[PDB]
């Protein structure tokens, strides 16, 4: 786990590179090393500004503060929907890997009324017609085309919980 | 097989009005190495007496450090230091002296009357810790049998489901004052393969079915903690009226009656449930809208009679409890109580406070009122049992009698003739303690060290410290001002080691500034 | 420059480790690899929550978004200050390397009136008495001790600009 | 040695009401690899005509896409595509046809009257690009000499420092209507080792010292662009009254007079500065409070005389300019003008619009009014020169005369007798262009490709695209709706390649959603 940080002198310099640091004293030493200065010459460090902004003072560790949770495929569902209005009331994106799912369900909508359709549900078929290869905007196109006043069928998959 | 709570829940429930303090820590891995060393360093500080004492005094001089907050710090401290009870006691004694010195102007008889300072709550928690053994070994069983005796006793009569008023009670404000013809019924109830095949449950004519369901749930779950029982609204109840028919019985359905705008809750009498009726149990309010039994100078004799009859039933159980609480088991005497009472007498003499009645008050204000009265009123602190509004109202009368026994001097007429004998018992108790051979600091500290060691891995001290640090943050300059004022704190550079923590917890050395 | 990310399955799993990723499809493949799953089983990823929160969806690169500017010692100054009020009106921290400097100057204060004292100025001496070894709270102590109604002298250093 | 602006500043100043478009990109290294490919892909889209045309039409149907915005897109486009002017012209012609087709209901004589659509601004920028050569090689010098001739001419008389009114002017609203005895003065001024050792600067009796300072700054900086001059308030002025004394001269000091509440600005006359006075120059308003010269049906003859005398002075300079603007240099004819005028005639015939006067209007509305009138009013677009309120008011009169010459039909009486001859010139010009041999698409595109190639590394196209993408974001679903509607856009999956960009620029594939 090696972190690399970009570095300049606040008064103007080329960009130096700095490896991850544990405390603030080590940082100054590393900065001074990369610019060939006695480490006692560094006063303080700022973040994303060369200006003397004390709200942007850097006095702690920097690092990946991100925990990534992955959602696996879980329960398969098949629900009927009666398209009574023009708008089903859902929003569709895709994960950039072929699966398009529900990002939003507008409150009060036709879909919002259906207990067994929740957000993050992958849509696999419309009336048994598979949606493989279908971009999110092509899926939403198919839905709007569907006959208003008739019932259609979705094959879905909830993420496991 | 008394359903005692395990020590960590007992502590949890009496220390606070606390799942976080029994499990793992919620600090993300983002700042985990940072805060790890932060808390570690802060623990060192908290165990430094020259810090902790200033830290508490400083916090207690801030007006916006409310009473609610002061009691939180105390309980947080007791948990943070529960592995170092010798040290913890050392701090409490020091802070108690400070509290006595501050109240040297006021009347001596006013000491420890309420819990409005950090040390006073600390004292209560101290008493909780040291008395838990007494509960487990001596007081708990008579306390529990009494609770059972009360429950059984009240149930021999009708109880209104809405208002909680019953035929029988110790509390005159809870007397069901309708003259209701209660007819007892023996039902033959079965459960879904649970326990025995059929039980003979006793119920009243007048019981709503929720009430009947609760009585059946008791009958099927005697040897089980309440927290594991099915809720009364989690079970259905069928009545085998014959071999051809059975019916589901509810408090409210299409057969419920309306009288003057309100719906009457269904009772066994309503369904005309016969004596001996076989039932089957399975797994499955606005007073202006509903009612049950209450269709809406001096107590008439029959209401007085009923107060007496339930007083009478419970009397041996009650004596047994008060005796357990106010007596010395010669097997193992109350070391912690002797230890503290002697500390009281010691501090009293150092100030020429010799008035026997003032000392009585100090002891009373330290143990019977701090601990025992709240235990009597809250048996849910000690046991895994149901808390019902009415039984609490009975325990209120009993707690009041206890309070009156520890005193020196309309609704108080019920136990009036038992209070003198109780006072003698209390006074005898206090004397018995004053008579048993004194125990050295060494012996007490060995006993405390054992409590610490026994319950090592019960509480998450890190979480406790983390909460304490929040207060330590909110008053960082005040704490700093107070450390600068203290000669010993500055001489040891506690100001640095404090801010060293603040920098770590905040991951920011620039969270440490000074004005000039 | 190697980034390492922490990973769980949203429905519960031990923590796996994942190396830095360029696009979103590569991420799923890496997650599935670390938990021994076919990569087509992953639906979507969330950040810092196991819950199905579409506001916490992860659909781009993660990495160090931080540029570190270091401030070197620059001009040395020596100013006189007449302590007319009890409060000089400045705030003092230190860089965690022996230098204590001015983090704030309260508006309208005695110091705020002096043109030649700006924020981020290191304080090196008070009446020629060096402040080496002096923590930020010890420096502020010395200032408050100074006689009210007399003039004192600061040796300062501005960061270079 | 005319102080022409370099092409990139000329472009910058006429395209917008723009430092970012000449230097480097402000995208942090945080998202730099991300946006790098984003802009790259977006450039491919912008150069896809089947995208760009829909993209512009779609944006122009949104009511909150203001006129100010439409002109910004146009100029942003001209810069984004300045390396592909062949393609850019192709787009402008297509959008111009669409604009003509939309206005097939309205009166033909109303085409291109204002600049309230993307294509109309595009057209103006097109004209700017293609005419810049004319400026550099033919029109610029007479334009500049005229400006000098005006400046020199107005300065032969008093000028009020506050109101800008002068004795001499082309604009009757700017006539100094006080009869001020102006006495010319020849000063002998020196600078701090700059230029020549002593100069003979001519000034008026009545000049404030700021005015005198400006006149001295002109005299010392003839061969230098104005942007490098010292400002008049950046220089001091001493007067060697003798060998024993010298004094600093200011507009305002301890010697300034007050008349009826207001302070009178100091003038050469005020200090009693003698003829021949030696000065030294060195480096160093509320109308109700101050004044200079203005102490506060039909024009009296002397004011008319002064309008005539300055008209007279400038007349040869002015003819020279109008001739340069409205004539064909046989050396190199106006290829781009021929090319576009022919496009006008072509589109006119396709709709049976043959009215000679309508075609005249189309051409007039395409070049003389689009480009030339704004150049006359804003010489600061072309040269590095000072912009003064009064000279602008003179150029206003001249610009008006130009406008009147391109037309077909009180303050307009000054150039009244010159307008007929100018109309003949304009009509002769238009005809001369219609007569020169037509140029093929091939020749035009070769000429455009050369402009593109000449000024390659002048503008930061990335920044230009980045700005265009902001509009592309704000109307993302509308753009998407418009691409879905177009048969050719859907057939080529432009919807994907669009959102592919949006995902990259935003670093978020979930910035791409669809409703249903």
Residue numbers in the entry:
A (entry chain B), C (entry chain B): 56 to 216
B (entry chain A), D (entry chain A): 1345 to 1361, 1389 to 1655, 1668 to 1679, 1697 to 1809, 1819 to 1925
The authors write:
GIPC1 (GAIP interacting protein, C-terminus 1) and its two paralogs GIPC2 and GIPC3 are universal adaptor proteins that bind and regulate vesicular trafficking of many transmembrane proteins. GIPCs contribute to the endocytosis process by tethering the cargo proteins on endocytic vesicles to the motor protein myosin VI. GIPCs contain a central PDZ (PSD-95, Dlg and ZO-1) domain that mediates the interaction with the C-terminal PDZ-binding motif (PBM) in cargo proteins. The transmembrane receptor PlexinD1 contains a C-terminal ‘SEA’ motif that constitutes a PBM and interacts with GIPC1.
While full-length PlexinD1cyto failed to crystallize, we crystallized and determined the structures of a construct with the JM segment truncated (still referred to as PlexinD1cyto for simplicity), both in the apo-form (to 2.7 Å resolution) and in complex with GIPC1 (to 3.2 Å resolution). The structure of PlexinD1cyto in complex with GIPC1 is similar to apo-PlexinD1cyto, except in the C-terminal tail that binds GIPC1 (see details below). The entire PDZ-GH2 linker and GH2 domain of GIPC1 in the PlexinD1cyto/GIPC1 complex are invisible in the electron-density map. Binding of PlexinD1 to GIPC1 is expected to dislodge the GH2 domain from its autoinhibitory interaction with the PDZ domain, rendering the GH2 domain and the PDZ-GH2 linker conformationally flexible in relation to the GH1-PDZ module. The GH1 and PDZ domains of GIPC1 in the PlexinD1/GIPC1 complex are well structured and form the same domain-swapped dimer as apo-GIPC1. The two PlexinD1cyto molecules are placed at the opposite sides of the GIPC1 dimer and do not contact each other. In contrast, the tail segment in the PlexinD1cyto/GIPC1 complex adopts an ordered, extended conformation. As expected, the PBM interacts with the PDZ domain in GIPC1 in the typical PBM/PDZ-binding mode, where the PBM forms a short β-strand to pack in an anti-parallel fashion with strand β2 in the PDZ domain. In addition to these canonical PBM/PDZ interactions, GIPC1 makes extensive contacts with other residues in the C-terminal tail as well as the two preceding helices of PlexinD1, resulting in a large interface with the total buried surface area of 2072 Å2. Notably, Ile1918 and Y1919 in the tail of PlexinD1 plug into a hydrophobic pocket formed at the junction between the GH1 and PDZ domain.
